[PDB]
């Protein structure tokens, strides 16, 4: 009884609890193609990760933003949800050669303009150098790759405030990693998310997604004397700050040193 | 390494204690001195005697690098700058301004439980 | 400007005799007519209580002239009802 819009959150019905999905869409026929791709689940003569890993693969396809531009004039109209994650994915337009999925701020009916050109339009735009951040509203297209540029693919967050301008030239915050001023020299598409919260919005029950895309997990403690200690008591656990094969359940920190994060401090989470 | 002679001193003051600052013509300090150095803080500190023996320690590491002329300004409200006054010319120094001010939040924050209402 | 500028048209158009300074044609109409830019105070200012009740004094007049036009001359009654409807 709050956000936009229709969340199948059935307040206890019949084998379909408080769901939560979709929105509006013009409904597109079906995607024209899907370069390269391949698949999922497992790899390298083995398998890896025993959590999730359903049926439906691919669909996502690349989304190379702006590698060139120099003068384009686009338009935008339709749109289409598709990648592995519920996040929509826009629909772009133009008429030159390729398509390249493009990003999508908030939803639109029948209009727009677009230019993708350094100094162009207040509204929706694309390609342009980086110093262009007076206010720095919703981004939803950030990226780290000089010639390239893409990154994110999720309807979660996608909104960063840009810092000032001092030595070492560092600015812009990031989704959820507090205070970590990153070095920067690229671009994005600056636009909203469309159904922000809509990314981890609850489902009814279990058995219509976890198989149907991903896989059935909520486990722990193998109770396996061999490499899995957790398991061998009257029904308690006693001591043992162990997770699995003594992997340290607690923080224990991790990656540091590194290229970057050598002048990109402050990354602590609460 | 200065030997400028004509320097200043970011004097200060506070209730419980007080701490004097001695810097150069533009800001960079030096060291520090006080009266509550040796055993004098619990109940002892309840008197300006602290601000008293404050120069009788500073001169040790201050009036050594040629400094007999210091600016003088009042900062903060101390338990007893009165004694600190004795550290005036009585110690072979110098004075400058009679300026006496102290910062205070014009409700800029949340002080203690009580801080408003009249009558 | 808010005085009677807009009301100027309500003189040779929606009014009584030449110079109607206070008839139904130019009475409660101004109220509903004001709603056009009145509900405009709802984009934000939704907390501006010092203006929201400023309309509470017209809640009556808006539907006060009833037992006088329907219960007699239907003219001043359905004068322009079919242009605003009743009970929303």
């Amino acid at each position: 009884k709050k956000y936009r819009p229709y969340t199948p959150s059935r307040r206890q019905m019949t084998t379909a609890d408080f769901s939560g999905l979709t929105k509006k869409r013009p409904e597109k026929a079906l995607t024209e193609a899907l370069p390269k791709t391949g698949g999922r689940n497992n790899r390298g003569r083995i398998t890896s990760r025993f959590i999730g890993g359903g049926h439906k693969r691919l669909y996502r396809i690349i989304d190379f933003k702006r590698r060139d531009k120099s003068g384009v004039n686009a338009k935008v109209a339709a749109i289409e949800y598709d990648p592995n994650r519920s996040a929509r994915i826009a629909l772009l337009h133009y008429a030159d050669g390729e398509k390249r999925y493009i990003l999508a701020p908030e939803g639109l009916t029948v209009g727009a303009t677009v230019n993708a050109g350094p100094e162009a339009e207040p509204k929706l735009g694309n390609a342009l150098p980086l110093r262009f951040v007076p206010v720095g509203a919703v981004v939803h297209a950030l990226e780290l790759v000089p010639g390239k540029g893409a990154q994110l693919a999720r309807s979660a967050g996608t909104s960063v405030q840009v810092q000032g301008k001092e030595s070492d030239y560092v600015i812009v915050r990031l989704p959820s990693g507090e205070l970590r001023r990153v070095h920067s020299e690229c671009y994005a598409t600056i636009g909203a998310v469309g159904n922000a919260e809509h990314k981890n919005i609850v489902l009814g029950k279990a058995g219509r997604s976890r198989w149907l895309g991903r896989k059935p997990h909520q486990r722990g403690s193998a109770m396996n004397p061999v490499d899995h200690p957790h398991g061998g008591g009257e029904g308690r656990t006693g001591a043992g700050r162990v997770p699995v094969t003594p992997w340290g359940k607690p923080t224990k920190g991790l990656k540091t040193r590194r290229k970057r994060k050598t002048s990109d401090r402050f990354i602590v989470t609460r | 390494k200065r030997q400028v002679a004509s320097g200043r001193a970011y004097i200060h003051a506070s209730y419980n204690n007080t701490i004097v600052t001695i810097t150069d013509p533009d800001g960079n300090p030096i060291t520090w001195s006080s009266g509550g150095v040796i055993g004098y803080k619990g109940s002892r500190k309840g008197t300006p005697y602290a601000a008293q023996l404050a120069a009788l320690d500073a001169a040790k590491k201050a009036m050594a690098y040629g400094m007999q002329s210091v600016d003088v300004i009042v900062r903060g409200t101390g338990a007893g700058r009165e004694q600190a006054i004795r550290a005036l010319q009585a110690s072979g120094l110098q004075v400058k301004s009679i300026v006496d001010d102290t910062p205070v939040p014009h409700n800029g924050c949340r002080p203690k439980k009580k801080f408003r209402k009249a009558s | 400007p808010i005085t009677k500028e807009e009301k100027q048209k309500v003189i040779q158009e929606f009014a009584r005799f030449p110079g109607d300074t206070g008839s139904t044609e130019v009475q409660v109409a101004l109220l509903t007519l004001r709603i056009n830019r009145l509900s405009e105070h709802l984009k934000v200012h939704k907390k501006d209580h010092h203006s929201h009740r400023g309309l509470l004094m017209m809640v009556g007049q808006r539907r006060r002239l009833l037992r006088y036009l329907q219960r007699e001359d239907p003219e001043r009654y359905r004068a322009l009802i079919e242009k605003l409807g009743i009970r929303g």
Partner: protein, 73 residues
């Protein structure tokens, strides 16, 4: 009781809004940053009600800081 020098509105070539030829905002103003209450205000209070923001602009506009300096508080 008792007050200070005779202060009010002798001249009038000025204006409580024009900046190109600001005068009273400096001369008749407090030797401190304290927004004139009524006494030392010189004028009274009516030409101060809105005056407050008329000069406060200077603050955000860098034209003025916060307050000045004094003695004996």
């Amino acid at each position: 009781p008792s007050r200070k020098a005779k202060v009010k509105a002798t001249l009038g070539e000025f204006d409580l809004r024009d900046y190109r030829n600001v005068e009273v905002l400096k001369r008749f103003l407090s030797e401190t940053g304290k927004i004139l209450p009524r006494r030392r205000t010189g004028l009274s209070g009516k030409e101060q009600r809105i005056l407050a923001k008329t000069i406060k602009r200077a603050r955000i506009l860098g034209l003025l800081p916060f307050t000045e300096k004094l003695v004996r508080k």
